[PDB]
Write a protein that binds this ligand. Structure first.
Ligand SMILES: *C(=O)/C=C\c1ccc(O)cc1
Length: 125
């Protein structure tokens, strides 16, 4: 080793976020999902690295293989009424870390406009 390595994650989410490069999208963030809860962030506007996968979360259900905090059906009972209604629009909590570099975000989910889905921003706090 010397100055050529990495790990897995060292930010807060992915491409659609606060500020680190910024790209075409919304004005908050997004991870996007599908019917069962499969991440869709993999075909709309790639980040910026050019070498391999966008991240690794691809194909992994945000349900229990990406988020080491969501320990329930999905969010907190806000994806069974917002999905059936056809106008998801709810906020609560979700965090992102609790041992490395903690935080105190406030999540703002909605029935996506970037490509038909049920995203989960993170908001600016
Ligand atoms: C997600 O992490 C939600 C809650 C929670 C509560 C206590 C501790 O220690 C970690 C996480």
């Amino acid at each position: 080793m010397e100055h050529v390595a990495f790990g897995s994650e060292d930010i807060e989410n992915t491409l659609a976020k606060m500020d680190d490069g910024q790209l075409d999208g919304l004005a908050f963030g997004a991870i996007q999902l599908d019917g069962d809860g499969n991440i869709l962030q993999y075909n709309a506007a790639e980040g910026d690295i050019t070498g391999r996968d966008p991240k690794q979360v691809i194909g992994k259900n945000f349900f229990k293989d990406v988020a080491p905090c969501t320990d329930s059906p999905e969010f907190y009972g806000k994806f069974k009424e917002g999905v059936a209604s056809g106008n998801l629009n709810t906020m609560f909590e979700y965090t992102f870390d609790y041992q490395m570099t903690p935080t105190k975000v406030k999540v703002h989910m909605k029935k996506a406009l970037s490509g038909d889905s049920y995203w989960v921003f993170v908001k600016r706090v």
